[PDB]
Amino acid sequence: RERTVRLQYGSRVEAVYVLGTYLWTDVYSAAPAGAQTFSLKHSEHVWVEVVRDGEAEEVATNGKQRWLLSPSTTLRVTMSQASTEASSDKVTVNYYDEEGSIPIDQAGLFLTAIEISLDVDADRDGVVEKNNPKKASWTWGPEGQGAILLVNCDREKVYSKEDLKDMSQMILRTKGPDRLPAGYEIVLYISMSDSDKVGVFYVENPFFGQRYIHILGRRKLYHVVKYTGGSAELLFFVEGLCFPDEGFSGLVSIHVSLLEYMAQDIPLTPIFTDTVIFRIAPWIMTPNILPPVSVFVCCMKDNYLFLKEVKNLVEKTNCELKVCFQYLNRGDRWIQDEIEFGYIEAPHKGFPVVLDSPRDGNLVKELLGPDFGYVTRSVTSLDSFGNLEVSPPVTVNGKTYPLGRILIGSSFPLSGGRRMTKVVRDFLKAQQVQAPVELYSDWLTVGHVDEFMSFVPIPGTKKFLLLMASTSACYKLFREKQKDGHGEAIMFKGLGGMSSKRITINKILSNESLVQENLYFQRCLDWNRDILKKELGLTEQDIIDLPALFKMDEDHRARAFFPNMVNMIVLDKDLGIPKPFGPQVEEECCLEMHVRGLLEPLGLECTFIDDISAYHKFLGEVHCGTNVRRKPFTFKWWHMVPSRR
Amino acid sequence: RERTVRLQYGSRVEAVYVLGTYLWTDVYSAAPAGAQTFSLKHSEHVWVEVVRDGEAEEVATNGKQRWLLSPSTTLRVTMSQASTEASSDKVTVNYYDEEGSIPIDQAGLFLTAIEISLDVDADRDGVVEKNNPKKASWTWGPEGQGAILLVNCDREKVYSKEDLKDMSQMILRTKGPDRLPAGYEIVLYISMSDSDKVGVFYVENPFFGQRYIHILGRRKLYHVVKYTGGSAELLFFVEGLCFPDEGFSGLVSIHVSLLEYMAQDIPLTPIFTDTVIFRIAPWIMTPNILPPVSVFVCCMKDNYLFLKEVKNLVEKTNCELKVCFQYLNRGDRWIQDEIEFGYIEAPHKGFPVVLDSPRDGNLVKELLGPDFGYVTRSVTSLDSFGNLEVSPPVTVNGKTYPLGRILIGSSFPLSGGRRMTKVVRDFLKAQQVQAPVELYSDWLTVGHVDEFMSFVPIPGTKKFLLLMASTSACYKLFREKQKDGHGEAIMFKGLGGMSSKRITINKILSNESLVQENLYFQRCLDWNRDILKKELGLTEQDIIDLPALFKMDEDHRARAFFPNMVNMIVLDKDLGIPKPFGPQVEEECCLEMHVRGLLEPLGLECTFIDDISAYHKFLGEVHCGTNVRRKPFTFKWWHMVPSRR
Ligand SMILES: [Ca+2]
Ligand SMILES: [Ca+2]
Ligand SMILES: [Ca+2]
Ligand SMILES: [Ca+2]
């Protein structure tokens, strides 16, 4: 970093020198007319080279050497240490005419050397290293570098060092004498565009106590920073205001400049500028294979079997159970549909962050606990978080997705069908590290991917399975039981509001239109199976089909005939599975027995959970919801190398 | 690419098979209840494997082999050649119960195999290869791949193959029997977002002649494509509608799908989809080192010396001269300020493309010739193309910029000064391949980088120089001439409207405020010198300083005292340099002689061009403009690897 400083014809030049740079100095312009040669002297801590046509020669502090004056003969000036009060740092040039050895004039350069570095933790260990030479760039991957910012997820003032504890540190390190020379100041600044992406806090007046003031952000694009002599550090705390999105990459920049005062009405000159970049950490979703921490449940207060059975399930684990009831502004599934658990992470810190999309809007929301960051937002059913899932880590065609891939239900491109809102799809895409895939959920009345699919770990391995609803599996099973003489076996036993229908296996198998409707739904399921296999790199060995059955509405879309078992609580080996209420054979539900026969040999332990008995019947709607909060991946997101956007 | 096709319990399944895929087939669901084992037969061109728990075994066309029925025992079906009218492609499965060897039922799969591939020239040689396996991705670099589109720069109808000659080809290649089976169609489509980025043309009815119809673009997101039997190719022509910009990466996608008809009011199912991506080629600027083709000039019709001298200059070269006059809607420099020559290139074709920003707006604009593509657009003087330059190819800190870097004049970030409009800055940035740098032009009244800087090739080498205006150089020269006894030497000789001012070297050197104003301007120049050296990787050996002098206005901004020599016509070794009208010493302009002494030893040939005499004086404004159209770089832009955006 070479900087231009010219000796002034007929005056001394005084300049601040910033360590890490060096000066090239024109001595030729300040030479009086008619002068021929020049010599120079300089102080102990200034290094001076004479550079003639690109060839550099170090010069002593007081020599008598002379050089011909010439536009192509210049000085190179460097200093390796900042000035103190004991410093007189200078270079003096004397000029000579053709005749005689006594100087006819002299021009000089008086220097004050200071160290200025805006430092961040670019090497991502949680401590702010000195002047990381890569701090002005942000690169992905294990060898990648540059500092990370967390969004402030907790929804002109004064803050202590406690309130800012979760933000990122940025330190302005300086070294120099008691004061900057006359006409200089130091200024921290950001662009107008970044002003809604970040905020920066600082103690403006530490003699009055440490009261952190917001100095950069909305409406404040610059802040003059007071210079302290000697070795000094100013500590700033930095927060992100928003996640990456359509139009925002996640990258922001903060600058510090030493500015020189020219004159009134003249802008100040940026003598030196140092830049750090941050990337705001993306919101990341947790798949079913990650260790469960807490199980969240919502239901009506009187659904007693559901609560007892969920509690019994969780007691088999080390998880905590959190019970929530219904609310005026929210659907009956809201803990599943309106709330999504995810996390954010920086080298120094991370925490869980909940996305909230209340049906009727927000009316206070925690009630979820202080441990969570919280982010709240013409909508269709496809906008629900029931329509959002994420796969376990996969590798596809040699490309690794170490954080898994987000799955979103949609309709065929030319179908004119429903689609999750663009703003939410754009958000998920912009987080980049989960590389989302759209599935086809629009053949379902409600239109949620969690109605037809889920993932479970295979106990005692690092592998997993895709679970798919299958109508073909159900028809096969019922046809077998009928052939076995079980055709009169009744479903919905114990649901009094279903009894008059007297639904048996025979009655189901003889309903011709229902058969055709379910062949079609199987085609819809299989279309998904194929996308999942392609985009997750799965084979048929990775998939288990659970029996399901649907009825068709007037839009030709599906709703559950009996509860969808695939939407289940996965806590490692233990699975809470919705109780299907299937046909009773030998006083056991043939659906429950079939599912156990598929899952148990893999060491998966099945517990059927009754969420419908309290309602006396089942019309395709479930009035309860569950959500599991999980430990984040061990893999650090910033070690991923995502495809070029 | 594995696709799910199930045998149907109690019916035959007919399916289209697309080459490049294969089917996995469930035979277990179609088995009657109570059946134990199955066998199979198949035709000559269908390959069938029995896959038991992931282990695959090829099966003969007619064997007697039997396998136990089981959900985990499936078929894998592949075909390597498309069907003809002579084909009967089929797989038949027979089912058996426990007792007896005669089949109790049979299910079968009748196949029609077709080839479908949407092909583009992804390997960038100008010919459309068959099914490039990378055609759905776009990667930069010499080993990079994916197809390139040109914007249509020539500003519900019918077109011949002639009008579309400059667009990109895309070919849908198919192979199959006389017709698709009942209930299938083929559809080309694009997203709504891409609908303003592209257009696609096709002959809908070739029996009526080849009349190309616009089938995809604004308002048309899909087009049903007629299937022809046998080996067939449908030829599409594709055009880009716009350059990359803020919010548009340059990437677009086109899809073709085989859709299956389900039933009325049911959306059609996308059985197979093939995708090609295009990148729209960026607009690229030509630096002064590229070979000149044509020189464009504008002036008033009576500036005779300018025209004669420019003509004489161009006659020393092989370039063409194009003379343009003044227009009601345009400034006097418009060929320089409102017009910018650049080019676009695709593997098959490229041409020059002019950016047009008329002062008062457009009132027909060519008049520049048919050989050029043409693109026309609260503005300040910084928005002028006089404020836009591009460097020769450089390497900086090991990073190559094989196309050079675009340079744009601006003001200091905190200055509240003028800045080129965001839309234009965003455009230049989005082209990506010239990686623009902002300089400081706002200390100039007009505020154009071309007032203070330019580039010239060094004859007989591959190197170049940066030319910088220097007030220090001028003061040095005048002080020498004064010391030499030339203080009364007069400037502006022959300009009658300057005579009464009687400006001499003495009069200039004694004006104290003008000295201080020009020291300041030199600081502005040097601030630029430093940015240029940093961002272009230049040393002091790459720079020559030309003497310049400015006067200051009420805003503290600079205008030329005498014509700025740095803004010059560079045609290889020959430089048209504005005639400065400097002080006469020994009947030669000391400015002209000084400039010759700097440039000539490098083999640069200097010609001074008088653009001001026709006006009788010089107030800082130039009434003529020039622009040089050049050959594009030999380096292909798509071979560059730009930084992640
Ligand atoms: Ca660190
Ligand atoms: Ca969810
Ligand atoms: Ca090709
Ligand atoms: Ca220009």
UniProtKB/Swiss-Prot annotation, chains A, B:
One of its GO terms (biological process) is chromatin remodeling. Ca(2+) 3 binds at D154, D166, D371. Its EC number is 3.5.3.15. Changing D123A: Mildly reduced enzyme activity. Ca(2+) 1 binds at D121, D123, D125, V127, E129. Ca(2+) 2 binds at N152, D154, D163, D166. Ca(2+) 5 binds at E340, F385, L388, E389. Ca(2+) 4 binds at K157. The keyword Hydrolase applies. Its cofactor is Ca(2+). Changing D371A: Reduced enzyme activity. Changing D356A: Reduced enzyme activity. Detected in keratinocytes in epidermis (at protein level). The active site is at C624. Binding of Ca(2+) triggers a conformation change that is essential for catalytic activity. Catalyzes the deimination of arginine residues of proteins. Belongs to the protein arginine deiminase family. This is Protein-arginine deiminase type-2. It comes from Homo sapiens (Human).
